[PDB]
Structures are given as structure tokens and as C-alpha cells.
Amino acid sequence: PVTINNFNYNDPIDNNNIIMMEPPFARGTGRYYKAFKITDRIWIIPERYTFGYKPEDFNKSSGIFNRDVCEYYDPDYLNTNDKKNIFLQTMIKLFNRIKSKPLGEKLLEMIINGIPYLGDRRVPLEEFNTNIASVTVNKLISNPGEVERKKGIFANLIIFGPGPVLNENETIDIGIQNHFASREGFGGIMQMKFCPEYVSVFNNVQENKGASIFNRRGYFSDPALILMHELIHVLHGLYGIKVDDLPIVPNEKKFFMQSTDAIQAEELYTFGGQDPSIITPSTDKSIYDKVLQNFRGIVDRLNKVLVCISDPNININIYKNKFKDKYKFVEDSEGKYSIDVESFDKLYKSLMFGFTETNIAENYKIKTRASYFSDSLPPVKIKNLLDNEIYTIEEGFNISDKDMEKEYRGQNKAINKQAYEEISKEHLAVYKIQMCKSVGICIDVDNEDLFFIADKNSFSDDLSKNERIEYNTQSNYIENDFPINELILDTDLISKIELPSENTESLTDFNVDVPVYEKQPAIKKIFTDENTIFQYLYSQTFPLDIRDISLTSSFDDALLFSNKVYSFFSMDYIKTANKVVEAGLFAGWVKQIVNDFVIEANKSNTMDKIADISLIVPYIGLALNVGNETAKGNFENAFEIAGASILLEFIPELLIPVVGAFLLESYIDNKNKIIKTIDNALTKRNEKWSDMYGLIVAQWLSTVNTQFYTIKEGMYKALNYQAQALEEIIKYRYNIYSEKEKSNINIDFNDINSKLNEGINQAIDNINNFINGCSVSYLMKKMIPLAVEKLLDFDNTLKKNLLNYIDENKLYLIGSAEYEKSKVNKYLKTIMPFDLSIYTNDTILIEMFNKYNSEILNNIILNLRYKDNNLIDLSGYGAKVEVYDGVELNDKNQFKLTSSANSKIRVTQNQNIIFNSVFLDFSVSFWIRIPKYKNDGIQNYIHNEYTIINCMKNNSGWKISIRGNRIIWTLIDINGKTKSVFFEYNIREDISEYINRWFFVTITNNLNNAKIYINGKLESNTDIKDIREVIANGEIIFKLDGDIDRTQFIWMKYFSIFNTELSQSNIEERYKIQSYSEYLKDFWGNPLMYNKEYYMFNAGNKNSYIKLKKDSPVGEILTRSKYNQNSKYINYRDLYIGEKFIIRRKSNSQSINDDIVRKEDYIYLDFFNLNQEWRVYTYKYFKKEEEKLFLAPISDSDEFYNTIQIKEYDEQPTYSCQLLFKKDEESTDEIGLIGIHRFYESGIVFEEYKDYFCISKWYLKEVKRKPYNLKLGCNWQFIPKDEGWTE
Ligand SMILES: [Zn+2]
Ligand SMILES: [Zn+2]
Predict the structure, then answer these.
(1) 448 alpha carbon to ligand 2 midpoint, in Å?
(2) Would you give the end-to-end CA distance of the chain in angstroms?
(3) Which neighbouring-strand residues pair with 1093?
(4) What's the fold here for domain 1-438?
(5) Residues 325, 326, 328, 332: what is their CA dihedral angle, to the nearest 10 degrees?
(6) DSSP 322-363
(7) Residues 6+ apart with CB under 8 A from 656
(8) Which part of the chain is CATH 1.20.1120.10?
(9) DSSP-derived pairing of the beta strands 42-45 and 33-39
(10) Four-way CATH pick for 441-472+529-827: 3.30.2130.10, 1.20.1120.10, 3.30.1340.30, 3.20.20.150
(11) Where does 1042-1116 have alpha helices with state H?
(12) Ligand nearest to the CA of 448
């Protein structure tokens, strides 16, 4: 167990537990410091740390020491004995809190027992030397007034009070002659500058600080955790594993980049969580190797140590026994020490991945920041840690007896206000970047607010080096993970070996390197005329001396006038916000504008399913103008085109090394060693793939996800600036009224802020999801594929390398050279799927990833869409698309393939996507419109099959072809085996649902079947179990290829490919999404138009048509004529028959050219009666359920309704539409719907029933029924002449 000593600052010096110490950096000169032994080998010196600092630097100045910290200065801290005593008692309390749990007590025990090796690199291997500044420190025994008498002591840690900056805690190691014992396996006395009262503050982006922007937000740190973070650094230094290696350095070439010190892997390991993932596997191993090497040196020393020249009283055996336990070396029955790989591995992982801030925080139930790379905030002062009502050893601030245990409420700034005090900004110094324009106006931006973008030099290029393979050679993976549970239950973790006595010979060689620090300017001026995120956010603020502002959508005006504030919300929102009303209408106006704010903010949940984008926050570009000028034009469109990439402030240059070649070792005659080499190179190959992915993840996290983090913080600030502006306006307008008026105004400012704040929180959740999705998108589509390219290349090189090796050994391999030759083929055949969980166990990140992978739309690997009279791939995988001159394109995303040789599209797919899942798993979906057969060309139509889409590579692939009325899907595996599935529509139907009409096709392939779906319905199925590997990523050629008629053509739309099998549910949904439109459609499925001649079709009376009756103003209903020739293969009813109708628009007298008919439009239904245009009317005064419609010349009669409202009552896809007669646009009095009715006629000569073009109220209730009745007589379709249909 660990004993924490007790004492008061004024207690007498006893030369044992309370001494007068001579600090290492004092170089054995100057005065001593009263020090207190809080525990064995650990000392507390309650005084400011002054080594390397100038006296005046303890005062706040125009300078700063660290560019990424809001530095608090206070030269009076610890300036009285009572202050010193408070420091002591507080440290005692923190140590008690630390040991209050197993994890912490073990951290302390490891630190107490991790005594520094007696010596360093300059010491002979056969000796212990205690006479060096990193091992021995002196204490003054003599009387006060002379250094006459001193005594030496061994020590592990010396904790001082803070340096100039109170909130800048730091652990320092001792260097001598440019080297550090704590970095070379020996370990050495560690020092620390620490402050328990002024703690750091943080806030989670993906979360919310008690959902209160108007209230204080964020959480303050538990000083016990801050202390344990530093203790972890001490631990590393004591075990001599605080090694340096390739650091993460920030790119600082652009003005928007954040500047900071290089970050060592040891720092990221100490924090834990996701940060270790920013350290690539290559570097993880480099560090591992360096430490192991450090330990080999120590173990050899233990085998060679014979004497201690500096202190004859040192018992060699005791130290050899202690160091053996410290480093976990093993010892044979003779006394020979050696390294036990298993024990070293466990110790290393325990020290680097077990004891971490994140792991300890979780164990002690203390909240901390999400990552090392997260904006730092201004610190706060803790009022009284010594007050058990505010802070306890058992629970810290999160005291259950105060219901502050749940959700870390004790650390919540908005909640536990009695626990802290804000800091005077006058004592704070922050490094700012002054962005000046070439004129002039200047904006100050805190360095913390900028973009942290790791420089390419941050990553190791070790993957480019050659690797020698041997029967020995084994895989090398370092799991940046360690089960904290076992560490806590490790029976032999903590040493049970005697701790040597601390007294020793006084130090006489005070040689040591003392760091020298100095402030740098707190403001750096840079010049740029750019108006990016910083400028846009600034335009949303106003000075403190101003109280009357007005919102504006003009960014430039906002920057120009102090009373003008920029808003990225709607034009309507802005106008309403600046509206001034009378006291009597003020309350109403407040409810209105606040409600509008919520609505505007809520637009963050906008969907864009037609573009295959489930979520889009449309106003982000207007809000920040981040990345590639996202404020100009329409953001949604720009995002559909370029995706996540447009939001990035900078596109990183990735390090993706050409993997080094393998050198296999030969073993002639030795059948085994040769086979082993083959197998080792294979398993090693997988290590390269994994290591490569690791390199990608590290770069994504430190160059890309960091940028997206800044965008999220920016949006949080933007939304708050918007709410603050509105609150300012509301206050101003309210305060213009007199006190008498105010009394009668019903307003609650707390509720206002409550509703605004809630709207913000909802928007933040949406924005967080949107941005995280973008980040993962970039990783998967813009990073991973580039790594796959190199890994695939590597595989090929290694493939020929292995086979060739199997040849040169052909003899020594006898009857197996072939078995292990295919062994290579089948191994290098299957590639390693990328799984982020392998490189990190951060819940937030893993969840982001899993979310992304659960969205079927991310399985889209090809999505050809129209943009600027051209077809391009919007899948994000960058397929190259060449559309040749013979292809016709329109903005309705329709494209036509004709019989011309140049009517072709060439698509070159991305070869770096896991498409070939080995068992064949993918889908193709598209809309198509196939013209009707030519009546005198029916033989060739039914006989000649022609390809329309062909995708082959090495004689393997797939293709879509057509033979008359049949569409065919064909697969051809690597062997040449073939399988087909097809859908054939009938060509003898009176009225067909498919011939020359747009319909939706979807083909899915899995291990077992090949299925064809038509309009969401499964139509065909073919077992493709026997079919082997199918190469599907060759060039896709869209072109009619076969013995076709020169008049043959095909229309297509929305062609897309999924690298997964779509479910019937996914397909149904896609069908409905792509079928959706604000406008009605014609019979062929094209947009319905005004001023276009159409024959009319009735879904409830298919074979009937309308004809103006000869002697009367009515529409008689007749039977359609039919195909008359004698072919046995075809039959149909004529479609171009009956009156030629034409839809005219009612509103806006913009003439009668042409235009799109939209649902709910008011129209006139006319038709041509020879050289005249007649109209369809309804006699106003009928009392029966229905009546015959009145067809006559155009005119305006008081007795007839002439206005029709075109409707769509069906909620499901249909080309049918309905026609409604209402008393007038405004009223809700429905006359009825246009349909067909049967009448009985009995005259002098004829008796029979006849149908007429009518209007009936009966349809009004029927169209409400579910499912929609498609057979209703009020369902009409408009048929215009079309080249795809001849009769
Ligand atoms: Zn640290
Ligand atoms: Zn940062």
C-alpha cells in the first residue's frame, strides 16, 4: 500500500521527511528550498518554479510562452507561508484521492518503486555511479547560515508550484551533456511544476454543455486527473522510456493553419483515447524497438555491474535485485539476467497503453476532453478544494450526496457554480493571429481557433523500405491497447522487492543542462484579402457599445457598418427580424420571429434523396464560406457535385509509399525453411496492408477530421451569434417602449432564450451528424482508395516474386511446387477489408464509421448524373466519363443511345474499390424507355439481340442487352461460364405498361441468385451458384451493339451501380424516390406540358376514347381501333385517336408558348374542332350525382364552370392524373371529377347503353380510399405523338 505523510509548512526541519533541498537546476548554488516528503521518493516544494524563467515574466505582458494556451498569470500565488501551507495540504488531499482507487494506488506504487538506474550513458558498464544530477540531490543538514554540511539522497520526483503560467502544468526531465537518462532506459529524477487551483476548461462538440448557450458552458477539470496526467509522464521518465521519435508537426504554410510545438508520440500515448491512432503503426514499432534496445543495454549492465565508486556503502545485490524487478528481467539459477519478451511486452503496454489519462478518467468517473487536439478554453479557479462540501477524496466534484454524480454534474460549469470562479481577462494572455487586409481592417483570431493540419513530414515512410523474409521472420503488430481491468488485477505488476535506503553520498558533480525559456509576441500580423471562416464569423458580431443593430444578407455591408450584422438565414427571416411594431403587436411579433429562428435553424435536417444524399445542412456555406467558396451559388448543388471535399479549408498531400520489395531467403535442399519463407512473406504481406491502412487513419485524423472539427465549432459559434443578434434586437425594440407600455407587454426573456437555445441544440445535432458523415466520406473515398492502389501494385510485384521463388526452388519443392504456387494465387487474391476499429477503439469514431457503413447510399460506386450538358459520376469515386457526340442529353437526366457509331458513352471505373468481394455482390439500377417495334419489322425485332451496356475485362464481366421485348442480364466468370436472367414484357396487350414508357429496372447479384426487379417488383430469378469469379470493374461501354435497324434507339436515366445486393425494400424506396416530381407526367412518363397536343387515355376504360358527338356538345365514348395486320406476334389498340386536347394555363398572361404542368395548377382543358380551339365545361346547375360535360367554343358564360384543377390523388407512382372542377379557386366547394359514365338510351328505333365524357361527385370520396384505386374512371393520362410509337 502507499502511505501519504502529513505535515504543516511551519513544521521544523528534521533532515529526514522535512529538509532543505538543493534542486537539480540550482547547479549546487544559490539558496535551498524547504521540501516535504509526501511519500517515499516523492517530494513537494511549495514554491514557484523559477528555473529558466525571468522574474518579470511572472507578470502578464504582451507576450506568451505557449501559442496554444490561454495563459493565466499571478505573481502573488504562493507568496506567503499560509499560501504555501494551503498548497501542501491540497497536494496531500490530491494524493489521497489518487490512491483512493486501485488504479491510482498502483500508478503511485510504480512511481515510488521505479527508482532511477544508478548512472547513465557516460557510465562504464561495470559500475554504478550515484554522483550525477539525475540520481542524487542534496539536502542541507548544517545550521542556518552556512552550507557547511550537506547529505545526498536518492529521489524519484520533485513537485514544485507553477512557473509564470499557473495553468501550464509540466513534467521536466534532466539532461546532461545533451542526453537524457529518462529517454535511454535508465530513468532519472523527474520534476514537475503544478497548480491545483487554476484548472483547464473543455466542452464536447458532439455533446452540449447542459444545453445552455446563454448559460455558462463547458466543464472544468478535476485537479486529481490533471495531476495523474503529469504522473504518467513521470512514470515514463522513471522507467527511461520517455523516448523521442518522429513527431506530429503542424503544417504552418497557410495563414489559416494553427501553429504549435511538435507533438511527440509519448504525449499522445499519455492522453490515450483516439490520439494514439494518430501515431502510425510504423512509428509505434520504431518506439517499441528503441525502448527494447534501451532495456537490452540495462540488462547487460546488470550482468556486468561490479562496483559503485561514488558510494562505497551502496549494496550492489540489493540494487541488482531491485532493477531486475523494475525492468521485469528474468534470472536463471546462476544469476544471469535476460529479457523475457512476454514480460517486456506486458510491461511496455502497461506503461504506454494502460496508464493513460483517458483510462484513468473512465475509472475514476471524471470527465475530460475528447482529444489532445480540441480547442483549449480559458481556465477557472477552484474556490476551495479543501472543502469537503465542494470536493472529496472519494468522488472529487461529482458528489452523490449532492446529486452531482450523474452526468459529471459536479464539473459542469452551468451547474456547479459554487465550486469555481471565472478569471479576470486582464490576467490572461492568448496568442492571436491578426488578419489584415491590404488597405485597412483587421480581425484578431485566437491561434486555437485556426485549423490544425499535420504536415506530411509527421508521418514515417518506413513502408517504402525493403524487407528480408526468412523461415524465422514473424508478424509484428503493436496493440495500442491494454485491458485496464487486468492491470488493476495484475498480481505481479507492483514490486514486492525492498526499496533501497535514500541517504547516500552528497552530490559533487552538479553538471546539468538547464532549460531557458522566454516569451514571444502574443500577436502575429498576417496579410490576406481572403474572406473565409474567420471573416464570416466576425461579420456576425457587433461592438459592446452598440445596442441597435439590424440583420443583413450582405456580408460586405456587415463588415462595413457596425450596426449591421450578417445573417445566413432566409430573406424572410431577416426582413421580419428588422420589423418594428406597436407595443400592442410586440408580443405577437416576438412569438413570430422566435418561431422563425427555430424553423430556419431546423433546416439543418434537409434531405436530398433524389441526389442520393440523405442529409444536407444547406446553410453551412452561407454561414462560414469555408473551403472552396461555399458561400457563392447554391451550396446543396455544389455539394452534390464535389461532396465533402468542398468544405475542407485545405486538401492534404497524403503520404502513400510504394511498399518496399521483399527479399526471400533461400534454403536449398531444406524443404521446410523454404516453405516457411513463402508462408511468412504472405503473412507479412497482410501486415503491410494493415500498416498502410494505419498510416491512412493517422493522416485522416490529424489533417482531415481536424478540419471538420473546426467546421463544427464554427457552426456552433455561428448559430449562437445569430441567436445573440436576435436577442439584442428584441431587447432594443422592447426598451423603446415606456414603462407603462412594457407592463402590458406579455414577454418572458428566459423562455425566448430557451426556445432559441433548443433550436440551436437540434441544429447542432444535425450538423454534427452531417459533418461526421462528410469526414468518413473523405476517408473512404478520397484516402483509402489511394492506399489500395499502392497495396494492389505491391501484391502483383510480390506475386511474381513468390511464384518465381517457387520456381528457382522447384526441385527442392518436388511434388508441391504447384500446390504452394496456387497457394500464392489464392492468398494474394483476397484483399484485406478496411476496418477502422482495428486502428482505434474510440467509441465516437467507431460509431461514425459503423453509421456510414449502415447507409446503403454509401455503397453507390457509380452514379451518372447530368450537370452542364454532360454526364458525370457523382458517386465520389471519380470514374472518368467520356460522352461522345452521338449521345443526346437533356436536363431531365435522360440520355439517348442511337444507331450511330458515335452514340456512345465510355466509363472508366475506379480500380481501387472492394468491388470483387470474391463471391460476387452488386446491383445495377436505371430507368429505360424502349421504343415500340415497327409493324413491318417485327421479325427482326423479335430475332435480333443487341447489347446496350457492356462491361468486360479479360473476357469476364457483365452486360445488358435487348432482344425485341426482352431485356437481358448476362454474367461471364473468369472461366467463361455463362448465365443469364431476363424480363420480357408482352407485345400482344391492348394497352401495355412498358412499351415506349419509362420504367425502372434493378438487377441484383449475390452468391446464389441474379434477380431482375421491374418498378420495384421482383420479376425474374436465376441461380448463379456455379458461376465463379466475375470481374466487374472493367470499362463500361454504353452503345447499341448488334444487328439493329438504323432507326433503333434507347432512352436511359439515372444509371447507378451498388457494390452490394439491394433488398426489395431498398429498391422499392429508390423507385418511389426517383419517381417523385412536382409535375404531372404524360402517358410515356415524361413531364406533362402546357400547349402540347395530347390524345386522352382513361385508366378505368382502357379501350375507349373521346370523340365530340356530331349533333351535340358532348363527348361520346368509343372503342379504340386495333392493330389490323396479320402478325401473330403482335396486338395493341391505337393510341393516336379521338380529339386532340391541349392544356392551357389559367394564371399569368405570359402568352401561350409551352411550360410544365404542376400538381394543383388551375387549367383549361381545350381541344381542336377543325380550325378552332374548343373548351371543356361543366354546366353549373346540375343536382344529380353526375352530368355530361359540355364541349363548345371558347367563351365566358355565367352558367358554366370553365376552370379545372389538375390533381394527383395517388400517393404511389403513376402516370395517371385527375381533373377537378371547383366552384372557384378559393372556395372549397368541389363540383366533381372528370370521368366516364354509362347512360341508357331508349328511342323510337334504338335501345342501348352509351358512355359519355362526364363529371361526377361520386369520385370525390373514392379517390381517398387506400390503396389508391387505379381502375377509377376519373384517372386520365395524356398521350402526345412520340417517335417511339408508330401505328
Ligand atoms: Zn502531457
Ligand atoms: Zn489543436
Answers:
(1) 6
(2) 99
(3) 1142
(4) Zincin-like (3.90.1240)
(5) -40
(6) HHHHHTT-EE-TT--EE--HHHHHHHHHIIIIIS-HHHHHHH
(7) 692, 695, 696, 786, 787, 789, 790
(8) 441-472+529-827
(9) antiparallel
(10) 1.20.1120.10
(11) 1064-1075
(12) 2
Q: Phi and psi of 295, rounded to 5°?
A: -70, -35
Question: Which residue from 1112, 1083, 1093, 1078 is spatially nearest to 1206, judged by alpha carbons?
Answer: 1078
Q: C-alpha grid cell for residue 416? A: 456547479
Task: Name residue, grid cell 367554343.
Answer: 1193
1021 is in an annotated binding site: yes
For 695, 700, 705, the CA distances from 836, given in Å and listed in that order, are 12, 11, 14
Contact 447, 71 (CB under 8 A): no
Would you say 1186 is a known binding-site residue? yes
Distance, CA of 311 to CA of 803 (rounded, Å):
64
With a CB cutoff of 8 Å and minimum separation 6, the contacts of 603 are: 617, 618, 619
Is residue 427 a known part of a binding site?
no
User: What single string gives the DSSP state of each residue in 461-517?
Assistant: -GGGS-EEE-SS-------S---HHHHHH-TTSS--SPPPPSEEPPP-----B----
| Residue among 1209, 1207, 1185, 1208 nearest 1263 (CA) | 1209
Residue 368 alpha carbon to ligand 1 centre in Å: 14
CATH 2.60.120.200 positions along the chain are 843-1075
CATH fold label, 843-1075: Jelly Rolls (2.60.120)
Give the residue among 1279, 1167, 1142, 1260 at the shortest CA–CA distance from 1207.
1260
Q: Strand pairing partners for 4? A: none
Experiment type: X-ray
Q: Which ligand is nearest to the CA of 257?
A: 2
Can you give the length of the chain in residues? 1287
- Count CB neighbours of 336 within 10 A: 12
Q: Determine the distance separating the centroid of ligand 1 and the alpha carbon of 271, expressed in angstroms.
A: 7
Considering only CA atoms, which of 1035, 999, 1005, 1038 is closest in space to residue 1021? Answer: 1005
Grid look-up 408580443 returns: 587
Alpha-helical (H) ranges within 548-619 are 555-560, 571-577, 583-602
Pick the CATH number of 1089-1279 from 1.20.1050.40, 2.80.10.50, 3.40.50.2300, 3.30.43.10: 2.80.10.50
Q: CATH 2.80.10.50 region(s) of the chain?
A: 1089-1279
Measured CA distances, 890 to 867, 1130, 1156 (Å): 10, 32, 15
Q: Are 1177 and 1190 in contact (CB under 8 A)?
A: yes
Cα–Cα distance for residue pair 543/540, rounded to 1 Å = 11
Could you count the other beta carbons within 10 Å of the beta carbon of residue 765? 15
SS3 of residue 1017 by DSSP: strand
Q: Which of 22, 71, 109, 230 is catalytic?
A: 230
Q: Which of 1060, 646, 645 is nearest to 853 (CA)?
A: 1060
d(CA 243, CA 266): 7
**Three-state SS for 615?**
strand
Q: How far apart are CA 303 and CA 336, in angstroms?
A: 6
- Residue 230 annotated to the active site: yes
Strand, coil or helix: what is 180?
A: strand
This structure's resolution (angstroms)?
2.0
Ligand nearest to the Cα of 705, by number: 2
Cis peptide before 12 (omega within 30 of 0): no
Q: What are residue 523's DSSP bridge partners?
A: 432
What separation in angstroms does the CA of 882 have from each of 45, 640, 642, 964?
75, 20, 18, 28
Query: Does the annotation place 233 within a ligand binding site?
Result: yes
Residue whose grid cell is 439584442: 728
* Helix, strand counts (H, E) of the chain: 26, 65
User: For the chain, where do the domains classified as CATH 3.90.1240.10 start and end?
Assistant: 1-438
Q: Is residue 519 classed as helix, strand or coil in its secondary structure? A: coil
Q: Is 714 exposed, middle or buried (0-12, 13-18, 19+ CB in 10 A)?
A: buried
C-alpha cell at 469: 523474409
Task: Give CA separation, 145 vs 22, 141, 149, 508, in Å.
Answer: 15, 11, 11, 20
